[PDB]
Amino acid sequence: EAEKAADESERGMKVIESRAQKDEEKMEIQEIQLKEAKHIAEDADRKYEEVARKLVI
Amino acid sequence: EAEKAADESERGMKVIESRAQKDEEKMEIQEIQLKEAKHIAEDADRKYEEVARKLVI
Amino acid sequence: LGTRAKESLDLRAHLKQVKKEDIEKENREVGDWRKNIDALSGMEGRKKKFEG
Amino acid sequence: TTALVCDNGSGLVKAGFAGDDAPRAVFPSIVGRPRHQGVMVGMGQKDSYVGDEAQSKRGILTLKYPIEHGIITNWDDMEKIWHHTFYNELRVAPEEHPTLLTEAPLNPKANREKMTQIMFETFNVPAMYVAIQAVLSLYASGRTTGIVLDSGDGVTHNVPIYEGYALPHAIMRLDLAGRDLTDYLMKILTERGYSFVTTAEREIVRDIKEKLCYVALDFENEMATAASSSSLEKSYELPDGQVITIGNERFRCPETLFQPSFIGMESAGIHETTYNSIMKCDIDIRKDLYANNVLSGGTTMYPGIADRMQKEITALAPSTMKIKIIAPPERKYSVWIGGSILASLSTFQQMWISKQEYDEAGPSIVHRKCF
Amino acid sequence: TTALVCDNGSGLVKAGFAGDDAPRAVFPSIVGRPRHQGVMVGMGQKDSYVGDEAQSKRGILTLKYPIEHGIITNWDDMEKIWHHTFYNELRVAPEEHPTLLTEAPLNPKANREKMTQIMFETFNVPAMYVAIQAVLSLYASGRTTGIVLDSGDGVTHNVPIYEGYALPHAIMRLDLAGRDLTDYLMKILTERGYSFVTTAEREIVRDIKEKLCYVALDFENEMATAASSSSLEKSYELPDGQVITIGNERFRCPETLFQPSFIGMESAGIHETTYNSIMKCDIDIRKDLYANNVLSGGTTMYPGIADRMQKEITALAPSTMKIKIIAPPERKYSVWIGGSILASLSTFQQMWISKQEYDEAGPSIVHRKCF
Numbered sequence A, B: 001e002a003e004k005a006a007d008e009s010e011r012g013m014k015v016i017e018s019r020a021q022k023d024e025e026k027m028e029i030q031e032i033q034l035k036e037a038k039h040i041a042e043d044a045d046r047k048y049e050e051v052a053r054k055l056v057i
Numbered sequence C: 001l002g003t004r005a006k007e008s009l010d011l012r013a014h015l016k017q018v019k020k021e022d023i024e025k026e027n028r029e030v031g032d033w034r035k036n037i038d039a040l041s042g043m044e045g046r047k048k049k050f051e052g
Numbered sequence D, E: 001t002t003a004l005v006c007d008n009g010s011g012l013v014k015a016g017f018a019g020d021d022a023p024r025a026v027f028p029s030i031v032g033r034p035r036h037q038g039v040m041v042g043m044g045q046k047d048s049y050v051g052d053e054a055q056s057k058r059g060i061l062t063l064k065y066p067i068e069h070g071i072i073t074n075w076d077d078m079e080k081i082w083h084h085t086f087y088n089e090l091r092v093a094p095e096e097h098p099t100l101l102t103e104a105p106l107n108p109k110a111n112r113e114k115m116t117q118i119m120f121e122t123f124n125v126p127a128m129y130v131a132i133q134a135v136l137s138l139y140a141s142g143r144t145t146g147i148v149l150d151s152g153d154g155v156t157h158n159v160p161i162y163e164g165y166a167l168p169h170a171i172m173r174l175d176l177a178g179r180d181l182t183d184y185l186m187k188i189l190t191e192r193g194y195s196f197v198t199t200a201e202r203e204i205v206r207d208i209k210e211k212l213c214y215v216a217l218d219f220e221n222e223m224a225t226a227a228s229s230s231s232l233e234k235s236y237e238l239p240d241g242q243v244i245t246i247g248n249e250r251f252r253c254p255e256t257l258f259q260p261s262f263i264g265m266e267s268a269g270i271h272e273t274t275y276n277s278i279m280k281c282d283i284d285i286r287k288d289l290y291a292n293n294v295l296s297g298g299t300t301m302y303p304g305i306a307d308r309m310q311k312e313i314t315a316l317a318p319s320t321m322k323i324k325i326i327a328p329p330e331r332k333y334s335v336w337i338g339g340s341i342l343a344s345l346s347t348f349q350q351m352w353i354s355k356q357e358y359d360e361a362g363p364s365i366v367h368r369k370c371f
C-alpha cells in the first residue's frame, strides 16, 4: 500500500510541476503583452494632446 | 522507509502547488491589465476620430 | 492594481496561517505504539484455566 | 485546556484534540448486539460491541447504525457511541474539555437540542458548540469564499459562501449519499449471482465499493466498452475465498450520484444541484463561486470524479466563466481539519455555549445567538 | 497652505487639491451595509463599506446613495463619505486645509446650513465656502458669459450668466438626470427578457448605459431603421457571461432627456428649457447666450448629443442668430477644474467663511454676504 501510494503521490507532484511550468510560460507572455500595451497607451496619449492643441488653435 | 518517502513526496507536492497557485494569480492580474489596455486603445481611437471630424468641419 | 492585489494577498494570508500553523499543534499521532514481540518467551502456561 | 473536536458523522466517527493535523481515532459508528444463543460459560461476552470492535466480531452480530440521514434515530445507541469515543478511544474525561460537535444543514431542531442536552447532562462537559459541516470544510481549504459540496455517507449538502457571508436561501440538501450507493451496489451485484443480504455483508459490499468502483468520465462510452472488451473486469477476494469479478458494475454504482433516477429518486444529480445552488445566488458573486468550487466528504473520493463534475458543470455553465474544482488529497478528514482550525482560533474562544448559560435558558439556547 | 476642492456631486465624489488639472480621487458615493448573515469568524468583516470598496463587494451588499436629487437625505452616511474622502483617499487631516464644497442651485437652505455646520464642528476645517455648481463649469471653459447646462447625475440645472452678472430669475432647474435614465433603461430592458432588480444590478445597468447608449440625431428615422435592419444591435457581456443584445434600447434610453414624457414627467426636454431660460433674459444679451451655450456634467457625455441639441435649438431659435454649443472633451470634471481655478485665485482669498465668523453668527452665516 505504501509503495503504490508513493507512486501516485509522485504522479500528482509531477502533474503539478508541469502545470506550474505552463502557467509561468503564460505569465511571461502576458507580461511582454502588458508592456506593449503600456507603450501603445502612451503613444495614444501623446496623439491626444497633439490633436487637442490643433483643435484649440 | 516507504512512509518517509511518501512524506517527502508530499512536501514537494505542497510546495510546488503553492508555486503554481501564485503563478496563476499572476496570470489573472496580467489578464485584467491586458483588458484595461485594450479598453484604453478603443477609447483613444473613438476620441481621435471625433476630433478629426471636428477639425475638418 | 496593487491595492486590489494586496487585498486578496492579505485575505489569503490569514487563511493560510490558520490552515498551516495550526497543524503544528500536534503531528506525532503518526507515531505508532510499541507492538512488541514475544520471541518464544511468553510460553509459561498450561491448559488449567481458560475462562479467566 | 484543549478542546475536543468530535465529529459524529454517519458511518465514521472522527475525533481528536484541537490543533492537530488528523483525527486521533477513526472508527465506524455501529452498535451490534449478539444474535445467537451462546454456550461457552465465562467467556466474558458483552451485551453490545460498539465501534471498531464490532467490525471484527461482525460474523455473529447484527450491526445497526444509530444515525440514518444526518438525523439521529436511536438516542441510546448514540449515547453509547459517544461514551465509547470519550472514554476508550481518547481516554479523556469530558468534565475538563470543551466539545465541538458538527451537524448537517437543515436538520430537525429536536436532534440538535437533544444533542446539547445529552452533552450537558450526561457527560457534563464545560461548554459545547455545534457547527455546520460545510463551513468547516471551507476552513480547511484556507479559502474564504466558494461553494462546498460535502457528500458524506449520510446526506449530501451544498452550502455556498461568499466573503464569509453564508447564503441561507441557497443551501441545497439532497439525501443521496454513500449508504444509498452501497445499497444500490448490493442490489446490482445480484445480476451476476452474488447475493449479499445480511447486515454484516453490507460491510463487505462497502469494501468492494471503496476498493473497486470509479466514476466514468463519459457514461455511454464506458457502457459500450465494458460490453465488448473485458479490460475492466477486476476481481476481488471475499473474506473466505471464492473470488468475484465485477464487470460494468464498477462505474454503474457511483454513477447514481449524477443520475439519481437509478435508485428511483426524482431529483437531479450532484452535477446539477451545484449549478442550481449557484444560480440562486446573486448575479455578482457567481464568477467567484464558479472558480472556487470545493469538494469534501468521503464519497467524493471516487477516482475520476473531479473531472466528470468539472465536465458537467462546464457543459451547464456559460462558456466564458472558468470552472475549477478544488479536490484536496485530504478530502475525507477535511471537515475535521477545519473543525480543529476553528477550535484553535482565539477570536472563537468566546462563542462557546457556557454551562451557566444553558442552566439559565434550557436546551433551546442553541438556536439563540450562540448558534 | 493649499485648499481642498471637494465636490460632493451625486453619483461620483470628486476631490483633490487646488491648482491641479484633474481630481485626485474619484469614486462612487455609495455606502452599503452587508445584508446576509456571515459565518466565517475573524474574517475582519466591517459594518459598512463606502466608496470604491463597495463596488467590488457589491454582490453581498445593499448599496444606497446618500444624495437623492442634489439634496442630502441621510446625513450620517454623508458624514461617513466625507470622512472617508478626507482620511483615506487624500490622507490629509482637515484641520489644516480650507474646503470648497459645491451645491446645486435652488436647493433647500437646511441642506447647506447642515453642510457648513458639519464641516465646522465634526471635521473642524479652518474655513469653507459653498459655490454654485454652474459658475465653476463656466470658469473651466475660460469664458465670462454663456448659459451653462450642467446635466449631472442627480439634477439638471441651467444657469445663464452674462459678463459675470448671474441672472437669478432665469435659472431653470429640472430633476431629470442620469439616475432617472438608469432606471428607465432598467425598465425598458425588460422588453427583451433581461430583468435587473437588485440594487447591485443597478450598477450593471449603469455600465450598460455608459458603454452602449447614444443620442440619436433624428429619433423617428432611427426608430424606423432599428426596426428593419440589424446594424444597431450591439452585444455586451454581463459580469458572469450570458451576453445580451441591445436593440433600439440604445437610443431610447437617452432620448428621455429631450422628451421627459417617457418617464411620465410633464416638463419639456433639455432642448427647450435652455431656450426658455434664454428667452427670460433681457433682449440685448440673447445673441451672446446663443453663441456661447456651454455643456457640462457627466450625463452630457452621450455620443452625439452636441449635434442633436444644436439642431433642436436652431429649430427653435430665430434663423439669423448663430447657435454654437461648447462641448469640451473634459466635460465630466469641468465643475471640479473650475473649482480648482476659483480656489487658486488671489482675489478670492478673502471670501472664505472664517471660523471666527461662524462662531459669531452661527450656521446661518452662509446665506449672508459670504455666500
Ligand SMILES: Nc1ncnc2c1ncn2[C@@H]1O[C@H](COP(=O)(O)OP(=O)(O)O)[C@@H](O)[C@H]1O
Pocket: D008, D009, D010, D011, D012, D013, D151, D152, D153, D154, D178, D179, D182, D206, D209, D210, D211, D297, D298, D299, D301, D302, D332
Ligand atoms: N476511498 C474511498 N473510495 C470510495 N468511497 C469511500 C472511500 N472512503 C470512504 N468512502 C465512502 O464514504 C463513506 C464515509 O464518508 P464520511 O466522510 O466518513 O461520512 P461522514 O460525513 O459521516 O464522516 C463510507 O461509507 C464509504 O462508503
Ligand SMILES: Nc1ncnc2c1ncn2[C@@H]1O[C@H](COP(=O)(O)OP(=O)(O)O)[C@@H](O)[C@H]1O
Pocket: E008, E009, E010, E011, E012, E013, E151, E152, E153, E154, E178, E179, E182, E206, E209, E210, E211, E297, E298, E299, E301, E302, E332
Ligand atoms: N461616458 C459616459 N457616457 C454616458 N453617461 C455617463 C458617462 N459617464 C458618466 N455618465 C453618467 O453620468 C453620471 C455621473 O455624473 P457626474 O457628473 O459624476 O454627476 P455629479 O454632478 O454628481 O458629479 C453617471 O451616473 C452616469 O450615469
Ligand SMILES: [Mg+2]
Pocket: D009, D010, D133, D150, D152, D153, D297, D298, D335
Ligand atoms: Mg461529513
Ligand SMILES: [Mg+2]
Pocket: E009, E010, E133, E150, E152, E153, E297, E298, E335
Ligand atoms: Mg455635477
